[PDB]
Symmetry: C6
Subunit: 335 residues, 6 copies
């Protein structure tokens, strides 16, 4: 028998008879008695712990009360409905402490086994939460561990947790894209609505790709989080100096070649001085055609008297690529 006092902000459903202290779900201690000091929420709770953990008890040890969490976000009261309320613990590398302060929520528990722990950078969290799932070829091979705002107030750092046997998958050249929420995909001549699976809608998801020839990533490497599969396309950035962005769309104006889609306009900017400039991603198979004296001009959706097509007039402006020869250059000027 030992004596440990823990300060609680609020203690609900705790009886001095049967309120065990469960470390990893095994009873390690027992609540002795609950008292309050000077009526200022100073819930002094005496806890007798088995002697083996008393030797392993240190200062960096955190306690928390588990309640049946049936709230707006919560399922985690399965043990708490059966056995009742209890408290838990996590031993740490502290020196020594008798008087503890209980943590308001259950903290995140690192596991001992070798698991890949990598960070992501996103402009915002999106529809992701802790406990959401990580897919590869739509196979769950991990989950989102935690999330934290970087000290620069712009971004959000998300760190995820790959399983042990799938650490070979995450390469240095892997890209992570977001899959969360749902929309409607209406095109011309009929609409069909598919975005994601039903597991991703409620809590969020992150898919990723593994390139073929790359070194395996490790040890808290950062990655960018793209907001769509379409934004996660590989390719070569080509800067364009546009005349005027009249009918151009930020992510929907394509680059035709022989009638087929090759590139996609991705960014559209208004530089100071009145210079509308943008940039474009292309298929890497067509980069060999991108050389010197290579022209990019825009075609209008004109009303042709011989070929009356309804589909082209809905699309609008359309970038056309004609090939060239010479040194490969990476920027062009549209007249």
């Amino acid at each position: 028998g030992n004596t440990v006092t823990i300060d609680f902000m609020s203690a609900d459903g705790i009886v001095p008879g049967r309120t065990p202290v469960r470390y990893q779900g095994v009873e390690v201690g027992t609540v002795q008695d609950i008292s309050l000091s000077d009526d200022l929420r100073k819930i002094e709770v005496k806890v007798s712990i088995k002697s083996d953990m008393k030797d392993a008890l240190r200062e960096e040890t955190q306690f928390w009360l588990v309640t049946p969490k049936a709230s707006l976000a919560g399922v985690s009261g399965l043990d708490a409905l059966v056995g009742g309320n209890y408290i838990g613990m996590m031993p740490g590398k502290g020196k020594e402490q008798d008087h503890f302060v209980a943590l308001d929520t259950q903290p995140k528990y690192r596991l001992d086994n070798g698991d890949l722990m990598i960070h992501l950078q996103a402009p915002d969290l999106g529809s992701l939460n802790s406990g959401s799932l990580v897919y590869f070829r739509k196979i769950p091979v991990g989950k989102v561990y935690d999330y934290a705002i970087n000290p620069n107030k712009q971004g959000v750092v998300i760190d995820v947790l790959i399983e042990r046997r799938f650490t070979d998958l995450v390469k240095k050249g892997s890209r992570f894209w977001n899959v969360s929420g749902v929309d409607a995909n209406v095109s011309i001549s009929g609409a069909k609505v598919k975005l994601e699976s039903l597991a991703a809608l409620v809590n969020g998801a992150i898919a990723f790709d593994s390139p073929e020839e790359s070194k395996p990533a490790e040890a808290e490497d950062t990655f960018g989080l793209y907001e769509d599969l379409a934004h996660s396309q590989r390719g070569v950035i080509i800067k364009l100096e546009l005349p005027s962005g009249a009918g151009l769309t930020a992510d929907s104006t394509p680059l035709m070649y022989q009638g087929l889609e090759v590139g996609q306009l991705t960014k559209l900017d208004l530089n100071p001085g009145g210079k509308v400039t943008g940039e474009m991603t292309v298929d890497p198979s067509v980069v060999t055609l991108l050389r010197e004296n290579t022209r990019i001009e825009l075609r209008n959706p004109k009303l042709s008297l011989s070929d009356a097509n309804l589909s082209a007039l809905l699309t609008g402006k359309t970038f056309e690529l004609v090939p060239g020869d010479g040194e490969p250059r990476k920027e062009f000027v549209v007249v």
Copy 2:
């Protein structure tokens, strides 16, 4: 043992044997006996309290009965299903009272820790309720504490509660916008429907932004609540003296420049004397172009024989900006 009589309007599921008085979830008192006086809902309930709280018992002390609230709005009967019905208390700074009147609902409990407590002003409550969530970069960093109608009958004051470690986020120049409910976003050439996350739909939400260079806000500062992210855009108000608001829309008529969207018409008014005047927000990057002899004229969605575009004819009237030089002025007259 002590004697405290509490008037209840209705007392349900209370037994004189086991009906504890739980202050913050720990048993402090016990219901002795329940009687009714002169058959006019005067439910005299005798309560014996432990002697330590009897010294701390004062006049401004409120009692309330907790029931399993499984009603139209309610989940909060989790403790009440397990243990049963009980009553609670909140001690206050009163002098002395023996005969109490029970409060009809559980009141709002201020916490002792340092948490930011700021007020919002809204024209109506919207789809917000107490217990709805507050996002920053879509990360929950607080919740709506309470709401109250100001003595002027026009507005609604909402006061929220930021967490302790996120008090650095709320600056003096922060803007709060509403995210609640859902709609459909139909544009031309296809429609895609995304408004908000699934947590915000049921109970409501409030997001906010943190500007980069501002003093940190504190101590019950007021803020305006914008009704949309689009209404929360920063910019410079530019007053326009319009000829006639024929095809103009209150929040959908844009300000083109080199084909790109710069401004957005925000307010449209009918002044007495037959003068249609409005005002416009602009991008702060383009304010340097707003000077003297700077003209704003409206372009019609005309049917051009060479460039037949379907997208422009659906939009309607369109404000065009041409730059000027001289002193920066903040108002213009459209002819």
Copy 3:
């Protein structure tokens, strides 16, 4: 101990051992024994009551059996699942009665505190039920108490119940409008679907407005119930003698002025003798323009060769207002 016989139409889950009589949730009586007379549903139930209520027992006292109501409409069996079935009572101003007849449902219980109790008149109930909520600035400040058909078979009288601290809100010039159900709001150039909050969809709601300068209403005053916020607009009725209601819509044909919407056609009638007459609500700011020699003529959505607008041709007929001078008149004739 006393003896009270109560006739039940059907008595379910009642044991002679433990079936208490709960007045306001406190045990006042106990079911002694259940017998049936001559096999014609004459369920004679003997009830022993405490002596204090026996003095307060009178003739206008109603009893009812509470069952876990988990039916198509019901949540109200929360006490009945825990404790079991019981019966309740409401004492009244009767003389004396021993043999009672049990009421088939739980009756409506007036509270003792000062609460505003006002009547509404509606052409039908709509999607309102008892227990639906009453909003002011979308804040719940009351609920629908009861509803009853007036002896004239045309209308429905609904009486609601404002809270105690919000009796200042309801003025004499307040208007009550209905918010219940959901629809889709499709306009031209895209559609967005928002009608109401999620609490109003299931059970119904009623919002209201408080004008600024009015006497506070009291004591069972009547009010009209408008079926929409749009039908609850203030304004001045202007009678129109229309030539022929060809493309006119009952609530969608607007009154333009300088391109802006001022009025809205509200009623459209076919008088005998072949005279299509209607009436219109206007903005109260524009009533000063409504005088003698003030003309209202309708504009067609004509195909203009210079200004080709798609939005006007979808709208149809359009009332135009030109101002006049002289004595203010309240009716006009459209040629």
Copy 4:
């Protein structure tokens, strides 16, 4: 103690110790012992009944087993979850019987009080079930009691049950229309979707109207069930001898008069001999205009060069009424 044997097809959850026989929810008998005869589902169940019901036991007495009915259609196991399984009884006007056969379902129980019991005739049941609700001004004033196929195999007879205090409402000239299911109401220039309340969607509903001057209906009077509110319109049938039903719709082709809708084409037939004839309901206010030498001719949605209207060209064929004088006739010939 008595002995009654009841044949069950299947007896589930019945213990010889505690399986009461509940007439109207009060224990009247007890299952003695369960045996099966010659392994052919002859579940002989001995039941001891109290002596008072033994005198009232007769031959036309039906027994049924109640189970927690949590199936595809069922909520009615609320008593059966708490107390357990039991059986019930309904005494009748038989002579004498000892060996009974249990009914496979719980039969319909007529109540003793004066309630109106009227029959409806419908071409099919629709989305109505027993236990669905009956509205008047959208107030529940009854429910569907039963339904049965008439011996002619064409129709379905539905008999409903009005409450006691609302028997004044049902008149001889009342019309009953169906409200069940949901659809979408898409018109031109925008669509809004409202059909019914949320209670009617799951189980069905029937609304009705009470005319002003009519005798009160009584005593199993029949009524027609219209399939819509629109089909329940009063009016005068006018037979039309149409030239050819080219663009005519069965329930959507209106009868204009001064641009306003007066009538509605309701039935459209192909008589033998190649004679397309139909019939029309009209507003009763306009029947005074229907006389001799009264012409009905159809107007085409023609493209007018001066009044270019998009709304008329979507509607199609349109019946026009011009008034006449003379004797009132009830049929016309369209040329």
Copy 5:
């Protein structure tokens, strides 16, 4: 007491103390002891049965374990939650057996009473499952008993089970059509979405019709299952030798006559040799017009300068019927 060993593949929640053997829900036997032989899933379960069933025990007797089936498809653990797990039995016409093998699922139980048991032939099962419902005039008068693939691998045989009192309904000339799932019904000038009731959506349904003059069907007669009400129309097949199926639709191209719809093209084929032939169902009222020298020619949706109709140009090709005289023939050639 007796001894019966039953092989189980997996035995869950079975205690040697209280695991009864319930034939039709009455306790007939008790599990004595559970042992496993040579660790190869040979779960030897000893069962002591009452002596009366031991005489009736035969070789063709099947046993099965019932578990609370709360899985993807299942509600049937209502008895299993209350009493616990048990096993059941069905005696058969075998000789004698002591060592049994337990069936993996609960088999289908034929009832003793006279019920109609007829087979259906369908090209696939569709959205039907066992336990789905059978409607007549949308009244449930039976249910789907079982389903089995015929030895020819093309079809699916479904056998259903009509109630006892409705055996008069099923005639020899009855047609069975499928009602399962839901779609959207979009027509021109507005769309309204109604397919089926809410009970049919989850599990499936089958409706049927009873013709007036036909012999009553009996004794495992086969029937075709049509996939829609529209495919279940009666009529006369008329073969057509079409010139080229250019704008013709398989089930949507109608047969006009005097502007009214008479027939409906149902099948469209490409015979070898380049001969597009189809066949058509007609109204049986119009078969008298189908004779010799009767012409069927197709009308184009032409743009008429006098009658500009939007509805006809959306429909497309349209078959026209002109009558003829002479001998009735059943095939035609379209030029």
Copy 6:
């Protein structure tokens, strides 16, 4: 009595008194005592096993803790709610082991009976999970057993499990297609939305076809998984050397013949050197027409003054087939 120590990562709801070891649901062992070694999650759990399994205990024996899995994915805690938590086992072909390591999840249990076990190759998993269903003629005849990524990082191997009596169905020439998720099917002249049954939406499904004349498949044969029924069409691949892929769609551009649809363009490629080539599946009935001097030319949706069709102008480019004679060739060049 025996002693077996098992390492757990976390042990939840385990009591040393009553925590049985259930092999296939029969109690085989009992948890003796729980200790932790040196505070590094070394949850040493002593287990006493019956002596018969102790002889059958070997080294390749896996243990796992079962918890009520009410998580994001979970129903499998039905036994665990009733009895409580327990652990299970699977004996294997090991030599001998005393100190075990508990498996983190319940492993997959191969059954002893003859069931077909075949592998599928898919480019990604799709919306399939383990426990999803396998249909034949929409009859459930198996389920997905497991899934695993092949060592080449491109694909995903899925192995399924056909029932015992349906092993005749799976032939060598069978094709497996995916049915999972839902979309919208909007076509011209109205839209109707049906994709799949209700079971497949939540968890996924896989349907298949059995051809008529093929050898029965067996013993871990591979199969391709097509992503749609339309992609699972049989036919003959015809390579096309297209001029320019201008209005051509990857899976929506058809091959007309006499107005009827015969083929469907399936793949469209941009070869290096600027050669847009594609390939097409055809009906096997038309392969006899595919010979030498057989021409495939594309028809435009031209505006014809005599036949004004709305349907053809929405479809776009359209491949036309004219037959030829000679040797059968399998590729063509479109000019």
